[PDB]
């Protein structure tokens, strides 16, 4: 067309290459709904290959009926958001064996990498907490060779989440620390996960003034408020 | 250079006909650093266990913290649903703009 | 002639689209585990009403992946679906 | 590939719980255009202001766009006429200066019978303009605040 | 059409806006200023009869506002016309008083640059567009957002309300736009048919027809009932 | 031009009132100190756990949890215009002649449509634009009841309005002002149950190197 001055000084090998490319070089996927589906689903390792079948039968590793139970028992661990404490060795072990059965590893998880994970979490959270601590205060006795007590708030762990933003996993956790950690003053934070409803301002409904005792849906939410 | 005019054809293939001069230079100096880091980490991962799955491990090691994440719509939908539980607060009814309380505004501050 | 060569070069550049070899889907631990837990409760609760088969494996009873022991670097795999 | 999408839509409605007549009527409702609302920018004859009721908006209590067709307190309803006659030093100024008094008096006497605090707003809002024109009658109308005060 | 042409801006003036009564113009610069022009040649100093001092300064009938640390990509005027709302690439939206020329409130709820701020019809609460593929509903008295509008594939470019202030319209760079319920947060309409990033959207004062323009130079109108 | 006059309901109370005298979708039971989530006709019975304490936060907010969508498609239950009807039985406050029956509605989200599409992606293998077109068509056919009608704008009709219906800044003296705002654990130390001798043998060997039985007996008597 009009690019004779530019498409010509490409060499003959380059042009003979670039008159051949097409769509259909891959075996990939690109539908992002389907990528999120395959990242969501739990997958169990199966066997069809005969050499790997005799390799997994020799080392006394079991059939997929045990790896599916191991998936379920690695998922059923009380993960550390619910327990409000750093996890222990059995929780680490069960979660890591469930993850290793998710990825395909049908072997055994070593007992020293759990302690390695423990020290990794130690130094990770110590780095984050230290570079939040030395920003609310200038420790004059430290950082030198010759006031009171402060509590770090969630706004501070958002404020030094960005002044030193390299310190994070950049996964979901930093997204929720940026997106949902800051609360407006009508947020009703000290709660029981349900009392921010509109009907808890408008009067507990009483009971059983009826022969058939079918009730209304504004009473069912008061029933579920108690639990 | 061959890749300056190849970047000219790449930019023109996505309908970018006006740009400056140092923009393919910046694209080439990005691609050099990215490929050098990827191949160095892949040489590490091949001394550990070159091949294509080695390159896949070396570019999955650094996908996790720099470029645009993949299919983030369902996590954002979950996060939106956690934020859109709370009903909207009571608004003023005096047809104007209401400020926050005075300590939450950039006025009672000092230098 | 340079004209057919130039138009076929521009035909070649107009057909090449790259995909990435490794893309890490932005997700969570907690929403994945809570999705699994709620799906396990409501999958163990009801029945299937099959034509010939039900989905799931031992103690899953839902749509479960079929990743092989080998080919762990594959991008897609089969799932379980109730077949009549 | 649009007929296959139509079939996927029909099977989705069938599995998500829409009756055959209900799905046919929702399709026919989806196809026809939004008809004309004759009060389209809310013309100032049959249109009202939005309520200032200190609640956030809510798109419920609302019917469909497919179907065919589509209190106001005294102080603003007097201030409209007040500004309309106040924007004129024309040939018709002092006749409006004449007729502005008894409409205010009758609105005040019809508003003390319903809402007393709105009436106390309405009296002292438009008090000091014609005191020199109408004497101590507005001073006599200080002590009216209820139905029995009339 | 009365055309306001700005002269000595060396390609470093982003999108501008005029107030209502057309007395103030606001232009966001690439070097983190907001420039405020009195379009009538007025004083724009708001003396208010105080007259204390300082005729020694240079007032070229134009005030500069320095509160941002990134480039200002959008700017919106209140219908009250007394406040200005400037959205930047530093991850804040700031509020300015147009009668003392200072900043009042910083609004931090984004982690990517802000591209389109827009007040409500009644001036109650403003919606925001950003690079993180989500729009956010705010309020001028709350520091942090109130709703998150998520569901687009690419980032949100333009934002606009319905003229009653009851729905939100967001257009995005994945060749589509959406209508969002302002209370429940979830999308009510998805309009497909474009072939380029939707860049400006506007809904008619009737309210039954939506119009938007893309970067392909094609405007198109849908009706919100049928959606086609 | 529309052809008929249509009557479509997009609330909770109106859809529930329309769909009384109909068979329910779920069947939830509140017994004493334990619960049961069954089908309308092996259905599980739960202890006070944390999956149920998060499911109960999705019934005081009447929306379906996003996790359940695919398995609802598996379990052949009846949907009602995208919603499903939870019938709760409180047995603690029963009456004599039947427990206290509630009948609430749960409403779909954007998450439920996304998870329905992600579970459609298992056996269909569609692209992204087919999901876009499918979502647009369903958001057309199922989201009626739009409040698209504009009132008067109070900022242009300022001359015919009360003066203090607006709030602008005012200048005070030298400033200006806006508007703001033990023993039991000791006595059971070795109380660990063992199912069988073989399991005890395996448990002591590897350290140095439900009613399934009745169901099996029943199915073996059936097979003969």
From Swiss-Prot, chain A:
Subcellular location: Nucleus
Key words of the record: Nucleus, Transcription, Transcription regulation
GO molecular function, one term: transcription coregulator activity
Location of region: Disordered: 167-198
Primary site of residence: nucleus
Function: Component of the transcription coactivator SAGA complex. SAGA acts as a general cofactor required for essentially all RNA polymerase II transcription. At the promoters, SAGA is required for transcription pre-initiation complex (PIC) recruitment. It influences RNA polymerase II transcriptional activity through different activities such as TBP interaction (via core/TAF module) and promoter selectivity, interaction with transcription activators (via Tra1/SPT module), and chromatin modification through histone acetylation (via HAT module) and deubiquitination (via DUB module).
Remaining remarks: Present with 7950 molecules/cell in log phase SD medium.
Record-given protein name: SAGA complex subunit HFI1
Organism: Saccharomyces cerevisiae (strain ATCC 204508 / S288c) (Baker's yeast)
Gene name linked to the record: HFI1
Portion of the full-length sequence here: 181 to 418 of 488
UniProtKB/Swiss-Prot annotation, chain C:
Superkingdom, natural source: Eukaryota
Subcellular localization: Nucleus; Cytoplasm
Family the entry assigns: Belongs to the ataxin-7 family.
Subunit structure: Component of the 1.8 MDa SAGA (Spt-Ada-Gcn5 acetyltransferase) complex, which is composed of 19 subunits TRA1, SPT7, TAF5, NGG1/ADA3, SGF73, SPT20/ADA5, SPT8, TAF12, TAF6, HFI1/ADA1, UBP8, GCN5, ADA2, SPT3, SGF29, TAF10, TAF9, SGF11 and SUS1.
Note: Present with 486 molecules/cell in log phase SD medium.
Described function: Component of the transcription coactivator SAGA complex. SAGA acts as a general cofactor required for essentially all RNA polymerase II transcription. At the promoters, SAGA is required for transcription pre-initiation complex (PIC) recruitment. It influences RNA polymerase II transcriptional activity through different activities such as TBP interaction (via core/TAF module) and promoter selectivity, interaction with transcription activators (via Tra1/SPT module), and chromatin modification through histone acetylation (via HAT module) and deubiquitination (via DUB module).
Protein name: SAGA complex subunit SGF73
Curated annotation (Swiss-Prot), chain D:
Domain LisH, residue spans: 1-33
Taxonomic lineage from the root: Eukaryota, Fungi, Dikarya, Ascomycota, Saccharomycotina
Residues of the full protein shown: 56 to 228 of 798
Other information: Present with 14834 (+/-203) molecules/cell in log phase SD medium.
Protein purpose: Functions as a component of both the DNA-binding general transcription initiation factor complex TFIID and the transcription coactivator SAGA complex. Binding of TFIID to a promoter (with or without TATA element) is the initial step in pre-initiation complex (PIC) formation.
Protein name from the UniProt record: SAGA complex/transcription factor TFIID complex subunit TAF5
Family as reported in the entry's similarity comment: Belongs to the WD repeat TAF5 family.
Biased composition regions of type Polar residues, renumbered to the chain: 31-55
Domain notes: The C-terminal WD40 motifs are required for its incorporation into TFIID and function in SAGA.
Complexes and interactors: Component of the 1.8 MDa SAGA (Spt-Ada-Gcn5 acetyltransferase) complex, which is composed of 19 subunits TRA1, SPT7, TAF5, NGG1/ADA3, SGF73, SPT20/ADA5, SPT8, TAF12, TAF6, HFI1/ADA1, UBP8, GCN5, ADA2, SPT3, SGF29, TAF10, TAF9, SGF11 and SUS1.
Annotated segments matching region Disordered: 27-70
Cellular localization per UniProt: Nucleus
Organism listed in the record: Saccharomyces cerevisiae (strain ATCC 204508 / S288c)
From Swiss-Prot, chain E:
Superkingdom in the source lineage: Eukaryota
Ranges for the WD repeats: 8-47, 67-106, 109-148, 151-190, 193-228
Location(s) in or outside the cell: Nucleus
Subunit structure: Component of the 1.8 MDa SAGA (Spt-Ada-Gcn5 acetyltransferase) complex, which is composed of 19 subunits TRA1, SPT7, TAF5, NGG1/ADA3, SGF73, SPT20/ADA5, SPT8, TAF12, TAF6, HFI1/ADA1, UBP8, GCN5, ADA2, SPT3, SGF29, TAF10, TAF9, SGF11 and SUS1.
UniProt similarity note: Belongs to the WD repeat TAF5 family.
Function: Functions as a component of both the DNA-binding general transcription initiation factor complex TFIID and the transcription coactivator SAGA complex. Binding of TFIID to a promoter (with or without TATA element) is the initial step in pre-initiation complex (PIC) formation.
Comment field on protein domains: The C-terminal WD40 motifs are required for its incorporation into TFIID and function in SAGA.
Other observations noted: Present with 14834 (+/-203) molecules/cell in log phase SD medium.
The protein's name in its UniProt record: SAGA complex/transcription factor TFIID complex subunit TAF5
Organism: Saccharomyces cerevisiae (strain ATCC 204508 / S288c)
Lineage, opening ranks: Eukaryota, Fungi, Dikarya, Ascomycota, Saccharomycotina
Gene: TAF5
Included stretch of the parent chain: 457 to 684 of 798
